[PDB]
């Protein structure tokens, strides 16, 4: 009948996410705003759009957990692993998990939830790690400097190579 795409990518442009639970470290508003901004990084340079769902099954299910949390990628307590996300697909596909033994912030302290979420949602949409140290998809955390976060070129090229 019909073929799979040549990459792990969503075939639909409208995607849904659900924030399953919340970190102690930030208010519900702070987390929601961080995630909204993180999805905006990718929607601003592609045809993709994101709607939040408050319950049920979203494409991208977002949760905070520690140690064993229901997959083969258990967390390791404070430091080390910060988060992980699954490539586009059914079920766990697209889901994003955040280690709640980390200190999450809206600031320069601890780990900035926005930057990590933006990175992880790259994964949720089909980007793997970049080798370019300036890239958002570089697998090392750094906190930014300029106030208006600008998605690096490598990440722009990468996401566009999947969705236009
Ligand atoms: C044991 O070694 C760990 C091996 N792994 C690679 C790192 C890691 C991962 O990439 N998972 O997706 S991770 O340390 O939890 C991690 C997660 C998000 C990040 O998000 C970023 C990325 C770049 C940033 O920098 C920039 F903003 F300047 F671009 C900021 C946050 C940075 C690091 C887990 C798996
Ligand atoms: Ca950890
Ligand atoms: Ca999913
Ligand atoms: Zn997990
Ligand atoms: Zn990563």
- What ranges do the domains of the chain cover? 1-164
Q: State this model's resolution in angstroms.
A: 1.9
Which of 81, 121, 147 maximizes ligand 1 atoms within 8 Å of its Cβ, making it the mutation to test the pocket? 81
Experimental method of this PDB entry: X-ray
- Euclidean distance between CA atoms 95 and 109, whole angstroms: 26
120 carries an active-site annotation: yes
18 by DSSP, 3-state: which? strand
User: 50-56 long-range contacts, Cβ below 8 Å, gap at least 24?
Assistant: 50/15, 50/16, 50/17, 51/14, 51/15, 51/16, 51/17, 52/16, 52/17, 52/18, 52/19, 53/16, 53/17, 53/18, 54/18, 55/18, 56/18
d(CA 50, CA 15): 5
- Backbone dihedral region of 110: left (phi > 0), alpha (psi from -120 to 50 degrees) or beta? left
CA gap 66, 52 in Å, rounded: 24
To the question of domain 1-164 being in CATH 3.40.390.10, the answer is yes
Which residues are found with C-beta within 5 Å of the ion, ligand 2?
A: 76, 80-81, 99
CB 83 within 8 A of CB 93: no
Nearest CA among 32, 25, 35 for reference residue 96? 35
Nearest bound ligand to CA 56? 3
With contact defined as beta carbons under 8 Å apart, do 88 and 8 qualify? yes
> Does ligand 1 lie within 6 Å of residue 142's CB atom?
yes
Q: Tokens at residue 151, please?
A: 């998605």
Kindly name the residue from 30, 32, 68, 120 that is annotated as catalytic: 120
Q: Which residues contact 86 (CB under 8 A, 6 or more apart)?
A: 92, 93, 94, 95, 96, 123, 124
């Amino acid at each position: 009948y019909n073929v799979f795409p040549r990459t792990l990518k969503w075939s639909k442009m409208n995607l849904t996410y659900r924030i399953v639970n919340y970190t102690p470290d930030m208010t519900h508003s702070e987390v929601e705003k961080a995630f909204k901004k993180a999805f905006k990084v990718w929607s601003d340079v592609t045809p993709l759009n994101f709607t939040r769902l408050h319950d049920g099954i979203a494409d991208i299910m977002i949760s905070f957990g520690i140690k064993e949390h229901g997959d083969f990628y258990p967390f390791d307590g404070p430091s080390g692993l910060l988060a992980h996300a699954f490539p586009p697909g059914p079920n766990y596909g697209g889901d994003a998990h955040f280690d709640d033994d980390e200190t999450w912030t809206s600031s320069s302290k601890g780990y900035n939830l926005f930057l990590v979420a933006a990175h992880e949602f790259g994964h949720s949409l089909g980007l793997d790690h970049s080798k370019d140290p300036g890239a958002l998809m570089f697998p090392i955390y750094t906190y930014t400097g300029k106030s208006h976060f600008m998605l690096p070129d490598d990440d722009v090229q990468g996401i566009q190579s999947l969705y236009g």
